[PDB]
Amino acid sequence: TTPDRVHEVLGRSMLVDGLDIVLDLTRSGGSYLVDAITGRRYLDMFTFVASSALGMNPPALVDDREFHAELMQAALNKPSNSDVYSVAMARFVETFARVLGDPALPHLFFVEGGALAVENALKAAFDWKSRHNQAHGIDPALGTQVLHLRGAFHGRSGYTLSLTNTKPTITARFPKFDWPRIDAPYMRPGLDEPAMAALEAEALRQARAAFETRPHDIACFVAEPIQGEGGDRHFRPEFFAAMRELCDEFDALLIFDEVQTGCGLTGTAWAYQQLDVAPDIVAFGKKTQVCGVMAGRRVDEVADNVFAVPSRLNSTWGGNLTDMVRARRILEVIEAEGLFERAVQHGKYLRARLDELAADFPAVVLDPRGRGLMCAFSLPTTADRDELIRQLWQRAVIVLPAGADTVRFRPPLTVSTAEIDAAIAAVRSALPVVT
Amino acid sequence: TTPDRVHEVLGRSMLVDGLDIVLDLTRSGGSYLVDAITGRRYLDMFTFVASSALGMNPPALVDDREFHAELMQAALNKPSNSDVYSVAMARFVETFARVLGDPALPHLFFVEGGALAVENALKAAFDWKSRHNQAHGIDPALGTQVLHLRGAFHGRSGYTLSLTNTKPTITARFPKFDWPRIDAPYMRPGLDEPAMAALEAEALRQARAAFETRPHDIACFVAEPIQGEGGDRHFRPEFFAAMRELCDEFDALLIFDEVQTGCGLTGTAWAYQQLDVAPDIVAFGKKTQVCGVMAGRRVDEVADNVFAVPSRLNSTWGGNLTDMVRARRILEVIEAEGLFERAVQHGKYLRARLDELAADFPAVVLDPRGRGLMCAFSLPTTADRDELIRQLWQRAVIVLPAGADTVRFRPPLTVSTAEIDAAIAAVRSALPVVT
Ligand SMILES: *Cc1c(COP(=O)(O)O)cnc(C)c1O
Ligand SMILES: *Cc1c(COP(=O)(O)O)cnc(C)c1O
Ligand SMILES: O=C(O)CCC(=O)C(=O)O
Ligand SMILES: O=C(O)CCC(=O)C(=O)O
């Protein structure tokens, strides 16, 4: 089976709705994808839905003969790391703790899949709330609901389908728990301090009302620090600092879903580090390759929590050993080359260019915004947005849509300023055509 | 970090409750695990919780220089196969269809994780039932419940936690849907044809009552063809053939969870092929490395089902490309070496030895049973079971417990009769010590 026959072969068994290219695994590299059919190079601001930190075939991985051997050893088999430990696994865990760890959150748990990472964070919270309730003379049957935001995306699994609320296509006709959902008070253009404060106060009012009308039954509040799939919606730190206090007042855990924001994209290991709010639990995935949770803060107040008691959390493999070995090497590159700081600097550059676009096309390029390399802007209508994406595709630049009218940039941490310039030049070329 | 320090390093971040050994990834091979600390060899009847078809480092994979290159190419990166297709992916899909495919079930969907495979089978059914209901003038809000068995294990995720019911530790304090659950009429020793028929009739009665008291609201019946984690409980084909008819009478899909039974263990590609019952959907995982669903039969009667409509099912990666490339090569070995048939023959051998043990130790070795290499026996009490497992561990044989009193054998498809003899010799040695 040959590149030109890939779509045909797959189409016999599956819905074939992805990109028109066929990925060349060997010739792709850095910020460029290679189409195996034409040899055409594509500028990648998409990074496999933001899951690639360094882009394709990074030199530090490709030229490292010792790493090749370690990776091969892992890749040939697939141990259940739940039950059977290895040196490869222990090296990953210690480097994860060194590069991404938070001293307040020492409990680590790994699994395959971002939705399942979020689910295990939820399970930790449900168990914590039931046991905390029990220890304080409250019915242990209480502690089963999850406070969350409108416009949230947390995955497509049994619990996260009750949380995710963006496109109806994701959730329609699937059974759900009736869990309390509040307005998301995100920053929008032309709202000053007082206007924002009033927006947040209303969300906060709705949050308090949920806690007071479902006493002892809300186990946690879950949020994305920046809502990705719902449209790159950013929140003031003040909002989360208030939610942190409300969570403590009502003995509920605060969980951040960093599956999209995490591993350096915003300029720090985690987006929450820049908001100055301490979570009790963090779910991670995508760029980390292996998915999972970090937990601590109030979790440790319940001595028999899911991190302390055998067999409360589990999966067959406990994460993919091949992903752990790759992730270990990627984390070492990040640490050695100062890639968080490179993300801060190139992030400021990308954002400056989007501000320039906004000035040049004030009616069309709306609400330029970003933290580190996680940047976006919006168009007047969804028709304009969809057309801009098509026009960029014709010009060999891959970007992702979000929400009704957003275009998002998800470059690798290793993106150069020339690559950012090429992307911006493509947008400038395409814009007169869309208008 | 050195083998002797692995447990120490991990224990700083996680609950360290697995095996005492440290896996040597290089020196392990075939039916033997090597402890990197001592160099001691362990006879493996555990196969990473039945997820390894060929055992460690199979020669056909290890000596194949071309495969090394293909595997390396896949392992270096982690594409989102949801969006971006490759030759590596298409080769896996076409070989999966050739070796494991069923002409009635042409729709394939892949994901990381066995619980998520089962969940997507459930989502397919919920959508199917709602749309089928709608097409026939029934409220589309109906079609949200799942008929299932007592003693079932389907995973630890949001939907499967409402289905799984073995150890309370798995499910306690996690919110659940109230879905109908019926008695499991499994074969037990000293029940003849008429006695079994009466047991099944009672389960069937309970099934019918569920359908009649929740009209149009049961989307599917899910079962393991042989219950694994609940205790290697086997069912007559007559039971499932009756359930197949009842499912059709009430317009509900029949789903088999073959995550544990699948990929040759019972002597055929799938256990259902030996029961002569046609499912509408099959969930797979473990030995297949990549997890997922095969669907067809009645699913196709609803033209806008989840396999025909974009974005109803999804995950970020759509399965691990490294797992697809490994699985492709493993499937080729199975096909080339006739490993399904080898499983039938060595399965008969293993079962014959368990019958012999039963004869020699009639009060102690209870209910020897099996299909292909999926074999087991039970002990009088759980204390006896736990002790036998410990005694086997001291003798360097790894087996797994199940339920209250079962010991299960999960050898690789490539196990030899001498290896089976060694395992049985260890059990014979340990038994006088347990009594
Ligand atoms: C992608 C995503 C998930 C789901 O991850 P998958 O690997 O596709 O299951 C969860 N939360 C957020 C914020 C996401 O970006
Ligand atoms: C293992 C198992 C699952 C769950 O698989 P994971 O990869 O651990 O999520 C589902 N069903 C059955 C029958 C199982 O054996
Ligand atoms: O739709 C999905 O399942 C993945 C979506 C996602 O993570 C994103 O596009 O930001
Ligand atoms: O407990 C788990 O999560 C995995 C169990 C399983 O699949 C088994 O032991 O048969």
Any descriptors?
435 residues, homodimer, pyridoxal phosphate (chains A, B), L-lysine_6-transaminase (chains A, B), Aminotrans_3 (chains A, B), seven-stranded mixed beta sheet, binds 2-oxoglutaric acid, alpha/beta, L-lysine 6-transaminase activity (chains A, B), Aspartate Aminotransferase, domain 1, four-stranded antiparallel beta sheet, 2 domains, 40% helix, 14 helices, binds pyridoxal-5'-phosphate, Aspartate Aminotransferase, domain 2
Task: Explain what this protein looks like in three dimensions.
Chain A is an alpha/beta fold and 435 residues long. Chain A has 2 domains: 1-57 and 339-435, Aspartate Aminotransferase, domain 1 (Alpha-Beta Complex), CATH 3.90.1150.10; 58-338, Type I PLP-dependent aspartate aminotransferase-like (Major domain) (Aspartate Aminotransferase, domain 2, 3-Layer(aba) Sandwich), CATH 3.40.640. Chain A has helices at residues 6-11, 47-50, 59-62, 65-76, 87-100, 114-135, 168-171, 193-213, 237-249, 272-275, 321-337, 339-360, 382-394, 417-434; strands at 32-34, 41-44, 107-111, 145-149, 181-182, 218-223, 226-227, 233-234, 253-257, 281-284, 291-295, 366-371, 374-378, 397-398, 400-402, 406-409. In chain A, the strands form 4 sheets. In chain A, strands 3-11-10-9-6-4-5 form a 7-stranded mixed β-sheet, with helices on both faces. In chain A, strands 12-13-16-15 form a 4-stranded antiparallel β-sheet, with helices on one face. A 3-stranded mixed β-sheet of chain A has the order 1-2-14. One 2-oxoglutaric acid sits between chains A (49, 156, 228-229, 260) and B (314-316). One 2-oxoglutaric acid sits between chains B (49, 156, 228-229, 260) and A (314-316). Chains A, B: Belongs to the class-III pyridoxal-phosphate-dependent aminotransferase family.
